[PDB]
Amino acid sequence: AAEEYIATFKGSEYFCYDLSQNPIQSSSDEITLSFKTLQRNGLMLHTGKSADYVNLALKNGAVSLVINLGSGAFEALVEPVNGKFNDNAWHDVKVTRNLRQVTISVDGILTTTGYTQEDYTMLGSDDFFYVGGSPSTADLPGSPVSNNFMGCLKEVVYKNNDVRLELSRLAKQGDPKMKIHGVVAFKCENVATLDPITFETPESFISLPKWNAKKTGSISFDFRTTEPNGLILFSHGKPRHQAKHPQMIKVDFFAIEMLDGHLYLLLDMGSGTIKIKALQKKVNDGEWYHVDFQRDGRSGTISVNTLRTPYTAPGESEILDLDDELYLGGLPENKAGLVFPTEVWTALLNYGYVGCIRDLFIDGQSKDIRQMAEVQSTAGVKPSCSRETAKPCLSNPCKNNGMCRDGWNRYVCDCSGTGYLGRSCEREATVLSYDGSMFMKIQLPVVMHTEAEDVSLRFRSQRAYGILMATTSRDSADTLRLELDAGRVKLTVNLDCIKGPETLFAGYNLNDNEWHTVRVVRRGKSLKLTVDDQQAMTGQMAGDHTRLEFHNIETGIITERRYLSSVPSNFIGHLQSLTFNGMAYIDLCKNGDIDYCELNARFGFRNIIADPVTFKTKSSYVALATLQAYTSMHLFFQFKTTSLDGLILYNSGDGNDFIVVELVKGYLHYVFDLGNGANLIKGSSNKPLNDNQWHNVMISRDTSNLHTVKIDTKITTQITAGARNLDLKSDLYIGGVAKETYKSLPKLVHAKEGFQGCLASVDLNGRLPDLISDALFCNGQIERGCEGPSTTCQEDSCSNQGVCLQQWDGFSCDCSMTSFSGPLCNDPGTTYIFSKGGGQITYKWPPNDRPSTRADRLAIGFSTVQKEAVLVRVDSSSGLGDYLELHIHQGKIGVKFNVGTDDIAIEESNAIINDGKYHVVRFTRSGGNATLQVDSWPVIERYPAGRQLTIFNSQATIIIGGKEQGQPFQGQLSGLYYNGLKVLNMAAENDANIAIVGNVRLLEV
């Protein structure tokens, strides 16, 4: 009721006066108020729908006036001249309008004047008068800010010649026409400033509370960074099924990210996405930028520093139905139920934001974001903004040549191309060996789909061909491959149809067996490829589709290739620091940080020798299919030999065309004619090479006709005449040729006898031939490996009556029935000591795994002084009766069993075994029949007469020790085998289904 009429606004409160009874009708009016505030942005007052309205606000520290009397708006802007309006002092505004002529005045001095357009002269408002705030702004015309006020307002008046509306007073005192949303004190209270926060690490985020606006709403905030990439705000909907070419999880979402400098609003309301670049200029200069995003249904505006951009979502979709958390500064990892959509490139590239943020408003209301950061207890956030003293890279904090780069308050290091990893490149990175028959496949947990990727890795090979990395999909031909092709690195992106694959090449002579570093960056249609620190190669894919489906990431071999009928060759070499969208897969695999890893490659560097093969005679050779000619040639192989003369390779063509590799007086000769005549390049070594060590040999002829012979570490290069390289004709001979052929080989070839020794790692212009299997013909004997012939079975190969079996790589010993473990059944096998008092081990088959067999077999080792004891006992289920039992009775071993007819017993009467020394017993059953053997006595075998049941139904438990049967065993037992189960071992490995009970201890040796 009192002298002067003041009110305090805090961003959630506003007045709202109903003009509908008494419309404003003004051909001349006057507006007056004093404000007090610290905020760059806030709505003081507004009135009007339609094209008739007055809107007065503080907009980036200045006073912003828009009037429109119906035929065009007037727009004024008063700036402070020596100070700031948001200095938390009072400031007087006065608007005076006389027909079309507007005049505004801050503090009596600061003033401008102007006119509204065409010839309309009256303001007409039958709706609401809003003071201090609004329900929103995207529905309130000519409104530059969306933010509610945060300060004090007094003596707010609107008058004209007729009515006088003292809106400030009416508020305090109350009026049927007046309404106040929220709780407001009617003096001037101080409005707390909203402290800024910094996002120090990418991964630091915050959960903001749910954005409620379905149709219409806003967000405003300020940011500051030199970081070119970072996801700022993101929220999404709830899975609505069916992207009708790949089968993804579709969802409603919106996002604000930074990519490569520029800032983007993304939005998708049901009918597809729209990516809108929110300002043409890069905005990572480290200056505070204000963003105001408001929307009214399917359209809306985004603004950066008073510069607006209209946007429309495609479709007929008016509602953006967000549901759960609203994210700020980055996203949470391994959070169940979160979908990273493909269009938000940052999300899936793991580019969290780093940099300052402040003054967050949602739907007009201000939000204390420092406050949330203390309640959530979020790591990686600090409560300030400090554009720091000195770039951090000065300290040179990045070890082993890692490229430093200055970010917002942190050094950032790129340690690809250094063999290390980790923030500052201190953790040395795992290496992987492949011998052409090895792979390493990362089957991801869930089907990815990406529009952008970073993919980097290091390689090293003597081969000029082979797959480095490739993404594969169980459902299509889609891939992103790097491979070596003719000494070059070849990126290939291919996306299934429904005009073909897009390729990009980089670098040369890279099969030098020094490391190289490949770097791929894709961003939709844009491809970019850099080898080592050469010049980046770019390419722009044609074709409108850009989305890549992939279930797994492969190296070494491309295993997943249903739809391809042909594939790059397997890899021979070493990889390091494979990194895919932030993920260091090799390193994560070795350390066991991920389940979904599958490989038969090996960790750590090793001089590779790929599929060695022995040519036992000189006259031993094999014929392969013709060398594929044609443009350029890259031959590689290695060899071991005691002999100083022999022909290793031969293939001829039309006329005098041929190519040959031979060993002559221990030195390696390359010899050929490609239409100019016969030529000879000698391989460079000092010593003869028949030194029984392994040597590397690489012959090549590029399309510039430059021939290279390498031997171990030393190149020799030479030029040759420019003759169109031509098809070869004959079979390709390796290790020799036919006997009569030596009499008429090209003069200038020396050899009169074939190669004898080993050959390994044969690469024939991209082809890794199995020399034995892929052979078209063989002569003499060619055998696998380079270690002499493999061991074969003899009488005394295995021990303790173990069965010697022949395998491809030598013999083995089946120890099952022998009681002993180890390669030769000479090692002891797992033993349990049964001590005084009695005890018992018990296996219980899970209820639905109970085996019913037709033929059984069981073997055990033991020692005891007892005359009466039960040892092993297999019982069937309750109410079934079928069983099997091994026992000592009157000092002699015995076995008793039953499958559903009468009981059946075999005994060994001869061998006394209650003698304290080690014995072994073997039993077998087929139906009624059985056999029983002890140590090396002759087998006892029984056959009961007449009809006999034959299945041992529903085996339920296995009991060792006899205790239950009231005849406990004292002594030792080892090496129990029953129907494939090495039970005592399973006991010793704490098997889930074994309960040990009583005085039984394991003997650990």
Ligand SMILES: *[C@@H]1O[C@H](CO)[C@@H](O[C@@H]2O[C@H](CO)[C@@H](O[C@@H]3O[C@H](CO)[C@@H](O)[C@H](O)[C@@H]3O)[C@H](O)[C@H]2NC(C)=O)[C@H](O)[C@H]1NC(C)=O
């Ligand atoms: C338990 O052992 C008895 C006797 O060892 C098994 O019966 C016998 O099985 C053999 C081979 O299956 C029979 O040999 C015969 O040889 C001729 C000539 O090639 C062939 O044409 C016949 O058809 C037959 O296979 C033999 O007749 C048979 N003797 C009998 C039934 O008295 C019995 O199968 C074994 N039980 C189990 C469950 O393994």
Ligand SMILES: *[C@@H]1O[C@H](CO)[C@@H](O)[C@H](O)[C@H]1O
């Ligand atoms: C280089 O600069 C950074 C400060 O961000 C510091 O962490 C290091 O100690 C210095 O090597």
